């Protein structure tokens, strides 16, 4: 596999139109009033080349493993500054849920993930609007099984919602974690097992240190497996 990520943005971004919208904003921000170009958030999205009139990953349609397509993207800070004009704090819920889903889908794809500012301000400011329990309850619409390759990513972006993210997935709760370790080792789902390891380790349920009985299992299961052993040794020597 290669570049098999979510890839929300399907087509090229309307450069010229975006550039036009990019103007009239610097002096505006220093001193929305201009919304005649794109009336609605759907129009703003399709302006980004977001989607051919779409917000949920259809895994039956293999939407979680797309191709490169070599598409261009506007600067992510400009994207998240334009998207945050159609916020409408005091509005209905059926539109705010669409806003939240559009934000979550356009934070998880590879293009917006591998093309982000070193210092994150907008990402933490947008998440701070919704509720953490609401952001993770109306979760990123990925199935619970493949929730971990994208959950590692969501925790790479926002690392503070890990304990608040395994509760909704597993509902002490360590029995479910240990049982779900199986049916991943029982099957040959090692990749999802690796990302499950990387997602759960360090929480209040699977802390670091030499002390969990995963190492024994792996030692018995023995090219993608080696990395599991190395990561487990590293986490034990902490």
């Amino acid at each position: 596999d290669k570049y098999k990520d979510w890839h929300f943005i399907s087509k090229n971004c309307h450069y010229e139109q975006l550039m036009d919208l990019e103007m009239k904003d610097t002096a505006y921000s220093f001193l929305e009033f201009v919304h005649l170009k794109c009336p609605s958030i759907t129009n703003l999205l399709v302006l980004f080349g977001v989607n051919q009139e779409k917000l949920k990953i259809n895994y039956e349609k293999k939407e979680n493993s797309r191709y490169d397509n070599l598409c261009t993207i506007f600067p992510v800070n400009k994207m998240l500054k334009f998207l945050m004009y159609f916020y409408s704090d005091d509005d209905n819920d059926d539109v705010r849920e669409f806003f939240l889903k559009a934000f979550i889908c356009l934070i998880l794809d590879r293009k917006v993930f591998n093309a982000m500012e070193s210092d994150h301000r907008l990402c933490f400011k947008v998440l701070e609007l919704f509720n953490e329990a609401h952001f993770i309850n109306s979760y990123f619409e990925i199935v619970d099984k493949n929730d971990f390759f994208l959950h590692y990513r969501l925790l790479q972006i926002f690392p503070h919602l890990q304990s608040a993210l395994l509760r909704r997935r597993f509902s002490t709760i360590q029995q479910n974690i240990i049982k779900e370790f199986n049916e991943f080792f029982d099957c040959k789902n090692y990749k999802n097992l690796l990302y499950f390891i990387l997602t759960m380790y360090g929480s209040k349920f699977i802390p670091f240190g030499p002390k969990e009985y995963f190492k024994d299992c792996i030692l018995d299961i023995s090219v993608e497996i080696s990395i599991l052993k190395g990561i487990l040794n590293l986490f034990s020597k902490i």
Binding site: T26, F208, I231
Partner: protein, 367 residues
């Protein structure tokens, strides 16, 4: 500030992991414990240097080295993109010394570890910089900048590619030095703060600002690719890249961001304004007495030199993006002094379409 037995094991394990060129695990060790309980696994300075050098081999010109270091690439990222994230994360931590966070000792152990690293620009373990002077091809950051006249080419070589309309040049100053130069300047601007209240010549003054002959050369060096009048034909020599191949794009890598010229001007003028503020940091510390002897800076007419290059411009977009600042509070105390300076120079030399912006900024600062 000495370490404990808890941190000595961490330091030794990190240095041994780096000795085997296993940088992936060196990053994962620090990353997999950031948003957890209050422990603050602090990086040793011998590893902060390796991070500063890893942040230089970007994927735009070194794809095979990165792809051959760690084939799996589990994080769907690159070492340079990660190292920069960790540097920024620990730097934003350092800029917030609060006791309601990790510890009052680990914080102080980080503050010492970041200050033991910029000073080069613990006799308990064998650090992996005794027997290593090359990180995957890039030599280092404390050896490449301590060369004759190299710390100044690193500044004058990123200030001219920050507005470039070419792919490798702009990329280099967008992905390596623009980010890295804002980090460094962020460290000297607090090391200097831990030199004035612990003194009874500063880190900002020597080895950073004295690279540096006159006060007008500074104003001609800050704006190095703007559209100003260009009164001095003897400009900066064609600057050479810091690392071999930095100004070359690899055939396999394909960029995906469409950066409008407004975006490039915004980023460039942000970096230039940051440099000007770092300069003004210490020039406002010299009292009404004698001027400093090391940098030979006047601190009273260097404003005239910069406000001359702003008034004598030729682009109205770049003239807005300089004063149209996002942080109207973080960069005070020198923008209104550069507003009255520019306003009091087009009126004296013309008795256009720029004096409106200066009045707007002078009114905006009325809180």
């Amino acid at each position: 500030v000495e370490l404990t037995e808890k941190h000595l094991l961490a330091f030794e394990m990190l240095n041994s992991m780096c000795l085997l060129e296993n940088y992936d695990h060196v990053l994962l060790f620090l990353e997999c414990q950031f948003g957890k309980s209050h422990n603050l696994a602090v990086i040793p300075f011998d590893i902060i240097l390796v991070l500063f050098t890893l942040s230089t081999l970007s994927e735009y010109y070194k794809e095979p080295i990165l792809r051959a270091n760690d084939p799996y690439n589990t994080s769907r990222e690159t070492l340079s993109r990660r190292a920069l994230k960790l540097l920024q994360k620990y730097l934003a931590i350092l800029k917030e010394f609060d006791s309601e966070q990790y510890n009052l000792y680990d914080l102080e152990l980080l503050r010492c570890q970041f200050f033991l690293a910029i000073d080069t620009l613990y006799r308990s373990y064998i650090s992996c910089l005794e027997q290593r002077n090359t990180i995957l091809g890039n030599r280092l950051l404390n050896l490449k900048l301590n060369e004759p006249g190299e710390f100044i080419n690193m500044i004058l070589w990123t200030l001219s590619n920050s507005l470039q309309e070419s792919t490798p040049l702009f990329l280099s100053s967008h992905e390596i030095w623009m980010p890295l130069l804002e980090i460094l300047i962020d460290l000297f601007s607090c090391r200097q703060d831990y030199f004035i209240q612990h003194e009874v010549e500063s880190p900002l003054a020597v080895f950073f600002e004295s690279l540096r002959n006159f006060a007008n050369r500074f104003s001609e060096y800050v704006f190095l690719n703007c559209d100003y009048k260009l009164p001095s034909d003897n400009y900066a020599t064609p600057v050479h890249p810091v690392y071999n191949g930095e100004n070359t794009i690899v055939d396999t890598y394909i960029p995906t961001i469409k950066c409008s010229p407004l975006y490039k001007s915004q980023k460039s003028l942000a970096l230039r304004r940051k440099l000007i503020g770092s300069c003004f940091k210490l020039l406002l510390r010299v009292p009404d007495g004698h001027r400093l002897i090391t940098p030979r800076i006047v601190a009273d007419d260097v404003i005239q030199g910069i406000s001359r290059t702003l008034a004598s411009f030729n682009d109205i977009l770049q003239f807005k993006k300089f004063f149209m600042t996002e942080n109207l509070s973080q960069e005070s105390y020198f923008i209104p002094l550069l507003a009255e300076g520019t306003l009091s120079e087009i009126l004296k030399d013309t008795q256009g379409t720029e004096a409106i912006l200066d009045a707007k900024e002078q009114l905006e600062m009325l809180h």
